Amino acid sequence: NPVNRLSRLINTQFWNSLTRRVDLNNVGEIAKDTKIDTPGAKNPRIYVPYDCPEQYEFYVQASQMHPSLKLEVEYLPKKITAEYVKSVNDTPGLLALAMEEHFNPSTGEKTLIGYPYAVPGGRFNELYGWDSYMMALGLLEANKTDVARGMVEHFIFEINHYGKILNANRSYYLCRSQPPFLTEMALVVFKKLGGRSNPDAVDLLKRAFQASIKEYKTVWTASPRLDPETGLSRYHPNGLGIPPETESDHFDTVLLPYASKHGVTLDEFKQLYNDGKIKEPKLDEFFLHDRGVRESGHDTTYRFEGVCAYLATIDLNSLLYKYEIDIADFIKEFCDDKYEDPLDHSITTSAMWKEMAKIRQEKITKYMWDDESGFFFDYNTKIKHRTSYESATTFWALWAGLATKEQAQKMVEKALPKLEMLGGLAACTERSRIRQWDYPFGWAPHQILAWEGLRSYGYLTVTNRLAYRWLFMMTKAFVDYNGIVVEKYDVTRGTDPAATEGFGWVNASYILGLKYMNSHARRALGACIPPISFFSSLRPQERNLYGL
């Protein structure tokens, strides 16, 4: 049965293939980076913060065992400047992450070994920000918790030492980030470890919310990201120059007009721009929006390219609402409703946080919600106007819990039909739109968040329907492509003419979706029954379970 075959592969072979753990021997296997080709990328390299002498010894000694790798270890400055990262552009490296202390019981000798984590797979050998929530959900269903806990330990380390949750842990990501899930990601691992019963669980919960509170204040509600007028946050990374990790050809088309304006060859224009010599304001802004699109994880989409820096997205501000609610709960329970940030000595109560979320919910509705169309749009903070682009991320409002019941149903009735395709939810409506993250492409995170969001607001029959559509499409591809799991899916079309690891959040979308399926539906999936045929075959009251 292909449903059980795919599931079984995801739970065992796939996650193991994607799992990474740093020991002394595997460095340079973990440090492999194909995305940046340049003379500095030939030898493996790791960067370490100035706070971690013990980690420095670990990796330094790692180079001493296997000089074959020619691995180079380098400390990092206490203050990491945008200019500084531009300097390591041509000499990249992997960033150290959380380490687990393991003591010899007889002789007490302490050895360091990395916490486990999952990579998205393939070209991406690093821990990524918003993939890791998706994967951790799937790993907790596969009952590998240590892999999920490791990533939480990593996000904590990322926030303290690197100042935010990184797009991924590499030199060239140090100014970027990605949509925050840390609060909810901490809760689901807390509950799996046994909750308050487990003292290690409670410890972890506190450290993750301590870090979450700092990420909130110092990153997302700080400037430049925070818009003072609206009080809503935008994606505004401080990265400088042209991002190294793209294709050498990638930007050549937009750069070429500027080079001709400056009368030099493009390859010279590239170098002189990265040397700061050319000052072009209009182009400096473009690359600013580019880095903002890469911080949104949606690179690339038409609602963003040339648009989103100034944009306050339903995406980010929804996940912030979840942060504010989660933080409030944490303080009221474990902090006795009094929390004083040890950094700035700021006292806060749950009532205050619960307040802050109420204002956010008000201001989101003010600047975003549209009752006629049923969508949450994004607000441009520069020109002070609302976007017309209909996006699938509007369901994050449900996932966060900031929408009113009235908003939700108007959104289910009016908004959902335009996003619901054969394979589930397209990333945006056809009218709103060949880019990557636009129609006709569905993406796993969009599905996962909408499933749980729709469930919280009381529609799980819609989730059953949308999950069937997605799992059917994934199952048919598994059998038609002979075990190949593909990263991207066209939800409006059918099949076509190393997948041993799959792709992390696609794997997780499959299992998370199957929880919503009863045994009748799982069997229909094994037969590769299309949704139209499956639904029409059900007794009318069973068909109600799918919202039909």
Ligand X SMILES: OC[C@H]1O[C@H](O[C@H]2O[C@H](CO)[C@@H](O)[C@H](O)[C@H]2O)[C@H](O)[C@@H](O)[C@@H]1O
- In the complex with ligand X, the residue whose CB is nearer, 88 or 412, is 88
Q: Find the distance separating the first CA and the last CA of the chain, reported in whole Å.
A: 27
Among 128, 396, 439, 472, binds ligand X (CB under 6 A): 128
Q: Does 299 bind ligand X (CB under 6 A)?
A: yes
19 contacts ligand X (rule: CB under 6 A): no
87: contact with ligand X by CB under 6 A: no
* Residues that contact ligand X, how many (by CB under 6 A): 11
Return contacts of 534-543, CB within 8 angstroms, 24+ apart. Answer: 534/468, 534/472, 535/465
Q: Does 238 bind ligand X (CB under 6 A)?
A: no
Helix (H) / strand (E) element for 101: namely strand 99-103
What is the 8-class DSSP label of residue 79? S
Residue 297 interacts with ligand X (CB under 6 A): yes or no? yes
Q: Angle of helix 129-141 relative to helix 145-162, nearest 10 degrees? A: 160
Minimum CB distance to ligand X smaller for 60 or for 82: 82
Per CB under 6 A, 292 contacts ligand X: no
- List C-alpha distances in Å: 334 to 17, 193, 195, 208, 409: 37, 17, 12, 13, 35
Tell the residue number behind the tokens 């979840």, with chain if given.
322
Q: Strand, coil or helix: what is 441? A: strand
The amino acid present at 419, given as its one-letter code, is L
- What are the Cα distances from residue 320, in Å, to 86, 184, 217, 294, 359? 30, 11, 11, 18, 12
Residue whose CB is less far from ligand X, 131 or 315: 131
3-state secondary structure of 33: coil
133: contact with ligand X by CB under 6 A: no
DSSP letter string, 116-152? PEE--BTTB-S-BHHHHHHHHHHHHHTT-HHHHHHHH
Quick one: which segment of 191-199, 264-272, 294-302, 360-368 binds ligand X (CB under 6 A)?
294-302
Angstrom distance (rounded) from CA 350 to CA 356: 10
The count of residues in the chain is 548
Among 86, 289, 294, 446, binds ligand X (CB under 6 A): 294
Identified binder of ligand X from the candidate list 120, 150, 241, 374, rule CB under 6 A: 120
124 near ligand X, judged by CB under 6 A: yes
Query: Among 436, 132, 176, which Cα is nearest to 290's?
Result: 176
Any contact of residue 44 with ligand X (CB under 6 A)? no
Return the range that interacts with ligand X (CB under 6 A); candidates 65-73, 127-135, 263-271, 272-280: 127-135
List the beta bridge partners of residue 340. Answer: 347
Q: The tokens of 255 are what?
A: 């750069």
**Minimum CB–partner distance for residue 66 and ligand X (Å):** 29
In contact, 435 and 497? CB cutoff 8 Å: no
Please give the order of strands across the beta sheet that includes 385-386. 311-312, 379-380, 385-386
Asked if 138 touches ligand X (CB under 6 A), the answer is no
Tell whether residue 323 is a contact of ligand X (CB under 6 A). no
Determine, following the binding rule CB under 6 A, whether residue 489 of this chain makes contact with ligand X: no
Task: Work out whether 246 is an interface residue with ligand X (CB under 6 A).
Answer: yes
- Looking only at the bridges linking them, the beta strands covering 19-20 and 117-118 are antiparallel
Least Å distance, CB 130 to ligand X, is: 6
Q: Is 130 annotated as a binding residue?
A: yes
* Residue closer to ligand X (CB basis): 129 or 531: 129
Binding span for ligand X by CB under 6 A among 200-208, 292-300, 453-461, 492-500: 292-300
131 assigned to a ligand binding site: yes
534 contacts ligand X (rule: CB under 6 A): no
Q: Closest separation between CB of residue 158 and ligand X, Å?
A: 15
Q: Which residues are catalytic?
A: 299, 487
Smallest separation, CB 129 to ligand X (Å): 7
Q: Does residue 245 belong to the site contacting ligand X (CB under 6 A)?
A: yes
The answer to whether 178 is a known ligand-binding residue is yes
CB of 60 to ligand X, least distance (A): 29
Residue 396 within binding range of ligand X, rule CB under 6 A: no
Q: Which residues are annotated as a binding site for substrate?
A: 123, 130-131, 167, 176-178, 245, 294, 297
Q: What is the binding site for ligand X (CB under 6 A)?
A: 120, 124, 128, 130-131, 167, 245-246, 294, 297, 299
